[PDB]
Structures are given as structure tokens and as C-alpha cells.
Structure 1
């Protein structure tokens, strides 16, 4: 008969730089903390996670020939409405969304998964508009 949290939460705000990082090994931590598995007061149905900021998304890294050969497909609901974008041009034009895609993929699915995605806030560069939240840095265990 342990505790199961509800409205007894203190969601901090963390910050992460990505100057040389592999998005997969990074995202596998940011999603964990968005879900709250870095806390003792974890429950599967409450979103005990913690808000996250990411900077210099453009400045991520990859292994191998992914920039040339990794392909983000995306289909409309129209015939022949398949579309493809390489990781390179995703990185250039908008790395926000490719980070978001990876993290969304490794998040749980459902309303709760979406709501913990809503805590994420990715930004190109090193600007961080969310000064008011008084966040702190989070180095990566990996």
C-alpha cells in the first residue's frame, strides 16, 4: 500500500545542450525524465516528469552515412502522397522536429504520452526564452 502521487508534484525545468551528441542516446534520457523515471515518486498514470529545454539542436551529431542515407518518410492520406526528407536537410532546415520525432517515438503512446511531450520545448541555437522558469542544467549520464 505505497503512495501513488496526485497533484503533489514539483516540476523543475532542465536544460540540455547538444553540441556533439547523438540524438538517440540523448533522447533516450530526456524521454525518461519527461516520464519521470528519474524520480522516486514515479507513477505510471500521473506525468511526474520534469520540463526540458534543448539548445543547439542544429549542432547534434550522427554516426555513419545517416545524413545521406537516413530518411524520414511521411505519408499523407492521399495516394502517392508519400514524402521523404533526409536527416541532413531536416537538421539544416528544422532540427527541432527531428528531435521531436525521435523523442515522440520513444515516448509512450496515449493522452499521457502526448501530455508529457507537451513539456518539451526545443530551440535551435542557444537562446532559451524560458528564463522566467529559473531552470538548471542537466548533464547526461550517458
Structure 2
């Protein structure tokens, strides 16, 4: 019947800049996940990517509550026996702040092919400066 469906021809992506400084990792990430998916758009269509591009600046200034800086471990496994490796959140934020944000958001996106495509619209930067001036990105202020 009549429910409109977005498609490649119809879709128009904005670029947005989110400042991570002073934001809680998960609270910021949940909002950004929703923007990359396109959940803020009335033309949201579940089988295409209706989301916007997001730049995150000041990734190393992201905050964590509690004792998470010391106590949140990022595990990975190399698929070699005994190959569990770990970094603390402090080690992550100091030396891999872009990965830290990318992991949080990646875990909040849908998991298959379109989800993987949705992640490609994210761009995370350690500093205050991003290289995407030519895309003319607007500041997006995170809601509650």
C-alpha cells in the first residue's frame, strides 16, 4: 500500500559535529548511534541508511563515572590459544581515544551489513580539529 520508503535517490545526509568534551561515554554514544541510523528523521526506513554523518571531536576528553577509568577493561581475543588481551579504560582514553568511542558506538549500531555501512558515516578525532571543513558540518548539541 502507501507507506513511503526512503531510497538511495531520496536520501540526503547532513554532516554534524558533536563535541565529546565532558560528555559521558555511553550517553554520548547512544545519541550518536541513533543519528547514524537516521532515527531522528521522519523518513527513517529500516532497510536503507537514512542517517547523518557525525564527526566527534575531543574524543580524549570523554568522561566515565565511578571507578570505570581504572576498572572498565576492554578485552579482545586474538584467536590464538591464551590470546586474551586487555586494556583498561584509562589506557584506552589515553592512547586509543578514537577506538574507545568507535567501540562504544559500534556496539550500539545494528550488527549486520547495513549496520557496518552505518558506522562508515562516523569520524572520531582526538583533538579539537577535524579535516572535513569541505563537508560544511553543523554543530549538533546532544539532547538529554
Output the TM-score relative to the length of structure 2.
Answer: 0.96
Tell me the distance in 2 between the aligned counterparts of 1:36 and 1:3.
13
Supply the distance in 2 between the matched residues of 1:93 and 1:6 (Cα, whole angstroms): 38
SS in 1 for 2:93: helix
CA distances 1:2-55 after superposition (whole Å, capped 9, x unpaired):
344342111010001011000100010101010000000000011000000000
Q: Deviations over 1:102-126 (max 9, x none)?
A: 1000100111000000010000111
2-structure distance, mates of 1:108, 1:92: 28
The answer on whether the counterparts of 2:59 and 2:98 sit within 8 Å (CA) in structure 1 is: yes
Count of matched residue positions in the alignment of Structure 1 and Structure 2: 142
Give the conservation status (yes or no) of the 8 Å contact 1:13–1:136: yes
2-structure distance, mates of 1:3, 1:87: 41
1:90 to 61, 86, 92: 92
Aligned to 2:114: 112
* CA distance in structure 1 between the aligned counterparts of 2:9 and 2:100, rounded to whole angstroms: 32
Secondary structure at 2:107's aligned position in 1? Answer: helix
Match of 1:59 in 2: 61
**Cα deviations across residues 77-113 of structure 1 (Å, max 9, x unaligned)?**
1000000000001000011001100100010011100
Q: Tell me if the contact between 2:60 and 2:94 (Cα under 8 Å) persists in the aligned partners.
A: yes
CA RMSD of aligned residues (A): 0.9
User: Are 1:30 and 2:9 an aligned pair?
Assistant: no
